[PDB]
Design a binder for this molecule. Structure first.
Ligand SMILES: [Cu+2]
Ligand SMILES: [Cu+2]
Ligand SMILES: [Cu+2]
Length: 440
């Protein structure tokens, strides 16, 4: 019933600056008000729009009463501006960062990375988007009318207490299984409707849940055409009937909109501890798409981009990352995250093979590496699915072993280290994270 909220597409001003204010306010869910946090607003955040090769400065004002950090998930930027747990912005503080984007068009995102409290700060409402454009993507005639036929879809669950407030506590169960709830939000709204031009509709999907994996489909089983993953366009669209999306992952899809029939985007029950409990025991509506008769702008191209050949593996450095959960201690290579002790020093500008194992438990670990867009060689036992075979910043690890081919183009010293971690936020917050350096 409510219309789908559309994050503002925020570009630079004449001074080449973008302002983000982090703050607390109020939102309403099912007629009950709650304290929430947002960037440039009460909840969630804008879509920061960047152009490849054009530097911008982002002025970040922390108007929370606790410290936070601002991490650009998916961006290939130096450790200095990565906004991992060392990137502290004190209460009432200001921090400016220069972003010099040098990667292909993609939908990335941004969120807090406060040490030990990333889950709570995301749960409270902090997340925004990053839209990177380049000259290539603009030649494709994709749907491009922001908030009309090019729509961000940030999907998140929340657990609310009886008083209507967000209920987040990092207790033993929450630390093991993750924070999840029985209420689904779509750009902050409960089961919103979106009026979409007849023709093609582009959805920029973000699984912004702390712990819940998702599996997108349409209520009448019309296909979704995947055109992009975390790190940008696929070579060609990949038609799917369902689309699993792990925590922190993005996919852009095209879906057909026919004059007549409204339909829902839905999420299908998943096989994951906690997540099949009602109301997620059956297909669960995410949003209603309402066909309208206004001008469309784009269509589905036969070809999207050119992906590089995977290079020969001979002579590449191999790094092994063993994930574990010992009682209440979550760790990598037998170590809970130590912010003053990067685990290893990666080379800058050199392909490496990273092998990440979840052998020893059956929990779901979407493993995310900062500072890169990588290629998955093996995902949890098999070469990746076609729509997952392009540029990724996350790889599934669940009771098996994954292998990714990674290259870091920017420096990250000990004082501003890159993170590699499980993006089940409660696992990260209780130790399933390492720091690593790149270059000097
Ligand atoms: Cu990240
Ligand atoms: Cu420095
Ligand atoms: Cu995990």
């Amino acid at each position: 019933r409510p219309t789908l909220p559309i994050p503002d597409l925020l570009t630079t001003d004449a001074r080449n600056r973008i302002q983000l204010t982090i703050g607390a306010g109020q939102s309403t869910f099912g007629g009950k008000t709650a304290t929430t946090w947002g960037y440039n607003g009460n909840l969630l955040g804008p879509a920061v729009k960047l152009q490849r090769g054009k530097a911008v400065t982002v002025d970040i004002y922390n108007q929370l009463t606790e410290e936070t950090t601002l991490h650009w998930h998916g961006l290939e930027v130096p450790g200095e501006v990565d906004g991992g747990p060392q990137g502290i912005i004190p209460p009432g503080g200001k921090r400016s960062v220069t972003l010099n984007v040098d990667q292909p068009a993609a939908t990335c995102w941004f969120h807090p990375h406060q040490h030990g409290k990333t889950g709570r700060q995301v749960a409270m409402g902090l997340a925004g988007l990053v839209v990177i454009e380049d000259d290539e993507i603009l030649k494709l005639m994709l749907p491009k009318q922001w908030g009309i036929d090019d729509v961000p879809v940030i999907v998140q669950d929340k657990k609310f207490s009886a008083d209507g407030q967000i209920d987040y506590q990092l207790d033993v169960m929450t630390a093991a299984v993750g924070w999840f709830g029985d209420t689904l939000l779509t750009n902050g709204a409960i089961y919103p409707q979106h009026a979409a031009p007849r023709g093609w509709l582009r959805l920029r999907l973000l699984n912004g849940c702390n712990a819940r994996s998702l599996n997108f489909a349409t209520s009448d089983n019309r296909p979704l055409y995947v055109i992009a993953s975390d790190g940008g366009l696929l070579p060609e669209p990949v038609k799917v009937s369902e689309l699993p999306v792990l925590m922190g992952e993005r996919f852009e899809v095209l879906v057909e909109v026919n004059d007549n029939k409204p339909f829902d985007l839905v999420t299908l029950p998943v096989s994951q501890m906690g997540m099949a409990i009602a109301p997620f025991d059956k297909p669960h509506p995410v949003m209603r798409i309402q066909p309208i008769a206004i001008s469309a702008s784009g269509a589905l191209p036969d070809t999207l981009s050119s992906l590089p050949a995977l290079p020969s593996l001979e002579g590449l450095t191999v790094r092994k990352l063993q994930l574990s959960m010992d009682g209440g201690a979550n760790k990598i290579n037998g170590q809970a995250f130590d912010m003053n002790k990067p685990m290893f020093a990666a080379a800058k500008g050199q392909y490496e093979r990273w092998v990440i194992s979840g052998v020893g438990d059956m929990m779901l670990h979407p493993f995310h590496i900062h500072g890169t867009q990588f290629r998955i060689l093996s995902e949890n036992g098999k070469p990746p699915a076609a729509h997952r075979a392009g540029w990724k910043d996350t790889v599934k690890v669940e009771g098996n072993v994954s292998e990714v081919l990674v290259k870091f183009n920017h420096d990250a010293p000990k004082e501003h280290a890159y993170m590699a971690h499980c993006h089940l936020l409660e696992h990260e917050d209780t130790g399933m994270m390492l720091g690593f350096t790149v270059g000097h």
